Write an enzyme that holds these catalytic residues in place. Structure first.
Site, short mmCIF file in Angstrom:
data_model
loop_
_atom_site.label_atom_id
_atom_site.label_comp_id
_atom_site.label_asym_id
_atom_site.label_seq_id
_atom_site.Cartn_x
_atom_site.Cartn_y
_atom_site.Cartn_z
N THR A 37 0.86 -1.17 0.00
CA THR A 37 0.00 0.00 0.00
C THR A 37 0.90 1.22 0.00
OG1 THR A 37 -1.65 -1.15 1.38
CG2 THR A 37 -1.82 1.25 1.25
N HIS A 191 -6.63 -11.45 -1.11
CA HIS A 191 -5.98 -11.03 0.13
C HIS A 191 -6.81 -11.51 1.31
CE1 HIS A 191 -3.90 -8.99 3.18
NE2 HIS A 191 -3.55 -7.90 2.53
N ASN A 194 -3.19 -10.48 7.10
CA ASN A 194 -2.96 -9.27 7.87
C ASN A 194 -4.14 -8.60 8.55
OD1 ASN A 194 -0.20 -9.44 7.31
ND2 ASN A 194 -0.40 -8.20 5.46
N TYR A 196 -7.43 -8.34 7.66
CA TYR A 196 -8.51 -7.72 6.92
C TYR A 196 -9.72 -8.63 6.96
CZ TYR A 196 -4.79 -4.57 5.78
OH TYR A 196 -3.75 -3.68 5.91
N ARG A 243 -3.47 -15.28 -0.25
CA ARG A 243 -2.50 -14.82 0.74
C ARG A 243 -3.00 -15.07 2.17
NH1 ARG A 243 0.91 -9.24 2.10
NH2 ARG A 243 2.90 -10.36 2.04
N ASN A 251 -3.58 -5.87 13.02
CA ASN A 251 -5.01 -5.59 13.02
C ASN A 251 -5.72 -6.47 14.03
OD1 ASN A 251 -4.78 -3.56 11.19
ND2 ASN A 251 -5.73 -4.66 9.49
N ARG A 348 9.55 -3.93 1.80
CA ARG A 348 10.23 -2.71 2.20
C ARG A 348 11.31 -2.28 1.23
NH1 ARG A 348 8.84 -3.86 8.22
NH2 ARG A 348 7.35 -5.00 6.88
N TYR A 375 3.36 5.91 2.99
CA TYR A 375 2.01 6.35 2.67
C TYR A 375 2.01 7.87 2.66
CZ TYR A 375 2.17 2.02 5.29
OH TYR A 375 2.56 0.79 5.76
C1 LIG Z 1 4.46 0.58 2.97
C2 LIG Z 1 3.94 -0.81 3.11
C3 LIG Z 1 2.65 -1.16 2.71
C4 LIG Z 1 2.16 -2.49 2.84
N1 LIG Z 1 0.87 -2.77 2.42
C5 LIG Z 1 0.41 -3.99 2.55
C6 LIG Z 1 -0.99 -4.33 2.11
O1 LIG Z 1 -1.74 -3.51 1.63
N2 LIG Z 1 -1.38 -5.62 2.30
C7 LIG Z 1 -0.59 -6.64 2.85
O2 LIG Z 1 -1.09 -7.73 2.94
N3 LIG Z 1 0.70 -6.37 3.24
C8 LIG Z 1 1.16 -5.13 3.11
N4 LIG Z 1 2.47 -4.84 3.49
C9 LIG Z 1 3.28 -5.95 4.02
C10 LIG Z 1 4.04 -6.53 2.81
O3 LIG Z 1 3.23 -7.28 1.92
C11 LIG Z 1 5.22 -7.44 3.20
O4 LIG Z 1 4.71 -8.72 3.68
C12 LIG Z 1 6.10 -6.80 4.24
O5 LIG Z 1 6.78 -5.67 3.64
C13 LIG Z 1 7.16 -7.74 4.81
O6 LIG Z 1 8.31 -7.78 3.94
P1 LIG Z 1 9.57 -6.87 4.15
O7 LIG Z 1 9.97 -6.96 5.60
O8 LIG Z 1 10.66 -7.56 3.26
O9 LIG Z 1 9.26 -5.48 3.69
C14 LIG Z 1 3.01 -3.51 3.40
C15 LIG Z 1 4.34 -3.17 3.82
C16 LIG Z 1 4.78 -1.84 3.67
C17 LIG Z 1 6.18 -1.54 4.13
#
Ligand SMILES: Cc1cc2nc3c(=O)[nH]c(=O)nc-3n(C[C@H](O)[C@H](O)[C@H](O)COP(=O)(O)O)c2cc1C
Ligand SMILES: [Mg+2]
Length: 399
Positions: A37, A191, A194, A196, A243, A251, A348, A375
């Site tokens: 996101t 999805h 997390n 939702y 997922r 959440n 990330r 964001y």
């Molecule tokens: C800015 C940002 C937005 C994210 N948005 C979502 C999302 O909308 N839905 C979701 O399931 N995970 C979301 N995530 C989690 C990511 O899908 C991912 O699992 C998470 O970054 C863990 O990996 P990383 O540690 O390598 O970044 C988001 C993570 C970040 C940093």
């Protein structure tokens, strides 16, 4: 500004860079971009940013054969709740999504739309304004304190979905999925993690229903599975993904604190593998690493030593995408990918490195990500991150 105290390691010689096939797509590597996101969609209309979205995805589809799971997209107004998140229900939105998919396909990469339904994670006031309900599995358990605060402020109490409303939500998933494929999306990822909506049904803490959508493993998994059965029959099992975040407590989900959580998820995986027998095996299963139970927090805070997803491997035989803090740990990636059906999701760092894949194959410095622009309605921290060359010329290495 590269990451210090981090010793990269060339992973070009691992399976991370060996072609695999997911659905109809033939990836040239296994580093995936999970749903991230960024909140740059337009208001009103949850319209994909007509300015930066295309450039953003393009920058990350630069490495040919990249599987890109877009950012979460609302299936409809009721499924939404965040003004700046995109949707896949209107024409206005589909006209902008089509441009992004062509940019992606043009770079010979693939794109999978993640279908998103916030459930209780949505802002109630925003919903009261558009005349929308504040949905969730129940009405006696709220996400947290700040949320039951907004719920009351806009007299938009947390509503417990009835049977017809789930069917309506299921009608919208098929339409969102259809419109997605109609515009050239390679597939869609349901999805259900997390915290939702779907996850709120899977979780025993958030699901206190008595009907067939609660009260047992079977019932709490009912919703997600109907959606699975819906999109599979409508667009084809080879165009559907799923997922899950077993140990995530984001959440307000149960996580490893709940003892029967593993049973809740082993059940789901088994049903997938079951349909996988009827010749209908979803294109894949995406799992959020227990290492990450809260997507929004520091890089290292929040994990589980007494829990792992390795159990899904004993049930699910199709591909598996595991995501959560892998960029700064090539030693762990090197080992996790010795499994011929395991892909790796980087979140990330795909935000900070548009050419991440190249930096994994060669053991180069990673761009530091700026947490403040995750964001933000801006291009800064969205599409101006430099590639390894651009970072160099800019003397990012502090000479
Ligand atoms: C800015 C940002 C937005 C994210 N948005 C979502 C999302 O909308 N839905 C979701 O399931 N995970 C979301 N995530 C989690 C990511 O899908 C991912 O699992 C998470 O970054 C863990 O990996 P990383 O540690 O390598 O970044 C988001 C993570 C970040 C940093
Ligand atoms: Mg120079």
């Amino acid at each position: 500004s590269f990451v210090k105290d981090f010793k990269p390691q060339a992973l070009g010689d691992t399976n991370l860079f060996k072609p695999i096939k997911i659905g109809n797509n033939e990836l040239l590597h296994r580093a995936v971009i999970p749903p991230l996101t960024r909140m740059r969609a337009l208001h009103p209309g949850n319209i994909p940013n007509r300015d930066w979205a295309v450039e953003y995805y393009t920058q990350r589809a630069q490495r040919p054969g990249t599987m890109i799971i877009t950012e979460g997209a609302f299936i409809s107004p009721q499924a939404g709740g965040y003004d700046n998140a995109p949707g896949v229900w209107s024409e206005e939105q589909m006209v902008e999504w089509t441009k992004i998919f062509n940019a992606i396909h043009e770079k010979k990469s693939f794109v999978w739309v993640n279908l998103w339904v916030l459930g209780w994670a949505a802002f109630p006031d925003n919903l009261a304004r558009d005349g929308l309900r504040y949905d969730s599995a129940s009405d006696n358990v709220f996400m947290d304190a700040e949320q039951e605060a907004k719920a009351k402020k806009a007299n938009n109490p947390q509503h417990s979905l009835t049977k017809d409303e789930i069917k309506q939500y299921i009608k919208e998933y098929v339409q969102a999925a259809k419109n997605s494929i109609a515009a050239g999306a390679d597939g869609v990822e349901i999805h259900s993690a997390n915290g939702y909506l779907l996850n709120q049904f899977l979780d025993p803490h958030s699901n206190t229903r008595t009907d067939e959508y609660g009260g047992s493993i079977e019932n709490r998994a009912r919703f997600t599975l109907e959606v699975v059965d819906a999109l599979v029959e409508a667009i084809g099992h080879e165009k559907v993904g799923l997922r899950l975040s077993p140990y995530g407590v984001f959440n307000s989900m149960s996580g490893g604190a709940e003892t029967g959580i593993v049973a809740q998820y082993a059940y789901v995986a088994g049903e997938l593998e079951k349909r996988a027998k009827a010749g209908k095996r979803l294109a894949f299963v995406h799992l959020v690493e227990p290492r990450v139970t809260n997507p929004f927090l520091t890089e290292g805070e929040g994990e589980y030593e007494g829990g792992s997803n390795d159990f899904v491997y004993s049930i699910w035989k199709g591909p598996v995408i595991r995501a959560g803090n892998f960029a700064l740990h090539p030693e762990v990636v090197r080992e996790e990918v010795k499994d011929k059906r395991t892909l790796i999701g980087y979140g990330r760092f795909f935000i900070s490195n548009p050419d991440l894949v190249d930096r994994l194959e060669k053991g180069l410095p990673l761009n530091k990500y700026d947490r403040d622009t995750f964001y933000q309605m801006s291009a800064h921290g969205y599409i101006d991150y430099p590639t390894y060359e651009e970072a160099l010329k800019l003397g990012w290495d502090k000479k």
